[PDB]
Amino acid sequence: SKNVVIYADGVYDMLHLGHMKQLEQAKKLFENTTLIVGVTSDNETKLFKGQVVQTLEERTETLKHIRWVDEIISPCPWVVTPEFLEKYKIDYVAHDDIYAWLKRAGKFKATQRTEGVSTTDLIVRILKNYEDY
Amino acid sequence: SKNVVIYADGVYDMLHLGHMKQLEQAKKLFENTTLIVGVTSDNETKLFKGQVVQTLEERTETLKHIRWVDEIISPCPWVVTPEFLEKYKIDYVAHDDIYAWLKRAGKFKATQRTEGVSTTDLIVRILKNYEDY
Numbered sequence A, B: 001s002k003n004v005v006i007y008a009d010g011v012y013d014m015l016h017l018g019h020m021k022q023l024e025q026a027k028k029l030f031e032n033t034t035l036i037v038g039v040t041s042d043n044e045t046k047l048f049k050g051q052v053v054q055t056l057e058e059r060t061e062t063l064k065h066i067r068w069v070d071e072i073i074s075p076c077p078w079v080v081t082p083e084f085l086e087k088y089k090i091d092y093v094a095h096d097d098i099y100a101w102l103k104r105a106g107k108f109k110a111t112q113r114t115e116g117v118s119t120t121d122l123i124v125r126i127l128k129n130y131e132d133y
């Protein structure tokens, strides 16, 4: 009934079906939702997580095309804070214990990952068309 | 004002930003539109055009996530006929002379391609992180 504001974040490098189904699942947590999507910066992703193929600007321009995405914060903060939830009027964080405070506040919503659909999995399928010998 | 029905078709293998921007451009040809997207079958694509990484079912499930896509015909016919336009009440075909009859009927609408954003271009960018020697 009342509109519920959902927040999900990530790298979204080389956007594939796995990200899409995750975002859809976040978007449909409730009947009436606004899904805000946060895109991690190149520097912090590279320092804290690992290598990223596409720049922040490219990764954001691709997310803009996904039907479930209502709003994008680019770049997003690397750590979600309670002050971040308050300023953007976020009701729930959708993710796939650093996150214990979100669970304690009733604001953690799980979303599953789909294995086997990644961009790299597809390139693996390309290479398997070449018998080793 | 009046709702205009747009049709675009293609393989949409390994969906990337290039396809997305093309679909957006088709969707925004007019103020009020319904964008129908046709997805070529595996057999006909492989026989007439060339190799396709993802099956028809996978290529369609990914397009379903694109915000501009209103309706999908999967599989679509390989050749667009006037009887196809009539049955689906298509007003315009958006594409990037086999298509001379569409131009003659006022139903051909061009959409441009974006070079440099393909899935394969990104894998090229990955491989360039490895100095040859």
Ligand SMILES: NCc1ccncc1
Pocket: A009, A010, A011, A040, A049, A077, A078, A079, A080
């Ligand atoms: N992709 C992991 C991550 C998500 C949110 N903030 C930082 C890192």
Ligand SMILES: NCc1ccncc1
Pocket: A056, A057, A060, A061, A074, A075
């Ligand atoms: N669309 C947000 C953005 C714009 C320019 N650079 C990076 C991100």
Ligand SMILES: NCc1ccncc1
Pocket: B009, B010, B011, B040, B049, B077, B078, B079, B080
């Ligand atoms: N991708 C080329 C094509 C588009 C429509 N029908 C057949 C082939």
Ligand SMILES: NCc1ccncc1
Pocket: B056, B057, B060, B061, B074, B075
């Ligand atoms: N979504 C249409 C479709 C379903 C099953 N196989 C291929 C295409």
